[PDB]
Amino acid sequence: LVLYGAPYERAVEVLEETLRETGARYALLIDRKGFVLAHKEALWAPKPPPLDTLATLVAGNAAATQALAKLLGEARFQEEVHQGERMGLYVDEAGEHALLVLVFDETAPLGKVKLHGKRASEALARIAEEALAN
Amino acid sequence: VEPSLVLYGAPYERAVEVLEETLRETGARYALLIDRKGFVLAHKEALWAPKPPPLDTLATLVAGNAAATQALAKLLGEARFQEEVHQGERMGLYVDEAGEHALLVLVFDETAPLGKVKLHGKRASEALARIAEEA
Amino acid sequence: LVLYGAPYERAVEVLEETLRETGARYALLIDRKGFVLAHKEALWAPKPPPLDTLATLVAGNAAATQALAKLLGEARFQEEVHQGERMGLYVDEAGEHALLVLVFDETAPLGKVKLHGKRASEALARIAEEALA
Amino acid sequence: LVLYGAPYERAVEVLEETLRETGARYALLIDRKGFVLAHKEALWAPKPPPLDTLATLVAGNAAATQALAKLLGEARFQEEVHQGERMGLYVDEAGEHALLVLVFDETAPLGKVKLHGKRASEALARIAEEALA
Ligand SMILES: [Mg+2]
Prior knowledge:
Gliding, Gliding motility protein (chain A), guanyl-nucleotide exchange factor activity (chain A), structural genomics, unknown function, globular, Beta-Lactamase, molecular adaptor activity (chain A)
């Protein structure tokens, strides 16, 4: 899938809104292979690390954690949170073929990241679905 | 190859007590302390829970994951991720660093409130970090 | 860590010579988070796949294989070779913070890739440590 | 797949012979899921690391390197060699559903490890096929 035109504009709007609601630094919608479909960064945040690099590693992780998921009786993990000392990463499925990625620091309440991140992933899943079908 | 740590005597008992208490406080199914190499140092299961999946395999996979996510961590300016949560439709996994050479692992289902898992899971990892060192 | 001026030139020169002596297609010096410090491609070789993506994947692999390394009594693997039907990949540690990557096909003698690759990594390791000093 | 009866005995013989020919420490036939189908250790070698753990990590690696393989135009890497300061790991596809694993040290010439490792992988592939059939 490749987002362009109206669907792309709609996806970017959701990402922009998600950053405002969550307090996150960077938001991306990527396919499960690591291709960046859309991305937005908070004006207040510093330049992000290379986004294509981030996307590729997130996709790699999505494939890698399936062994753990299957051992627990799940096909795969739909939501994952990775927290460091200063930076955090939130990844949630945006439909069966895409992933919403949020990179955040201490100023983004985790509860808000998850609440609005989950809602954004559903909105993006719908946009991706329609872009794919007609 | 040997673990970065092995529990016996008092240290083991203190660790097991933390694991048992954590299961009660969180509602989780299984609790383990493993070294970053994948060896299980101590493990406890909730009395109500069914037989767990192979714990050695679980520990190995968690250890493999801990190594693998370091590329992402470095990209974000971190040495590594200290806390990680993986959520499926029903089953979830909570992993937190217990000192520099061990990891606390909690496997839970829908009957374990996530807020409780993280709250008591964090307390457990710190307690185990202290035990691991003195051990 | 980023290479500039002379240090960068010396790095590129080493990569160029390594391609010549090994017959490999692409040579890169990357860090553990997938950043490309320097790269060179053989003139005869086709356009390479996205180099930043290649570096990213190699970095991801470098992190992941440490679990296996430790089980075998090693902190990590210093040298790795991945071989497909036609394409191959050689990765060698260039110090503690960099990796030398050589992508090759059937026209590159593996013996030479490993022999000169190892030596090139040592040279690049010095250029790097001297670039941050 | 689960090896038993004659097929299992034949597989074990291949592993034992491979150890004799290579001087490797441990030899294993595992499925791509990480399950150990058969394994043998050199009598002169020290206790091996937990083999089930090793297999699980080798299988994980096999899945992880496919992205790199595909970027280079390969479906996956058929052969891989990881070398540390002293210990080495050789993994080769034994058919479409299994992997031959050899753990060796500086005393086992890599050339012979690869030659007999490849021979063994082909033999084990045929045995696994029959067993399943
Ligand atoms: Mg020379």
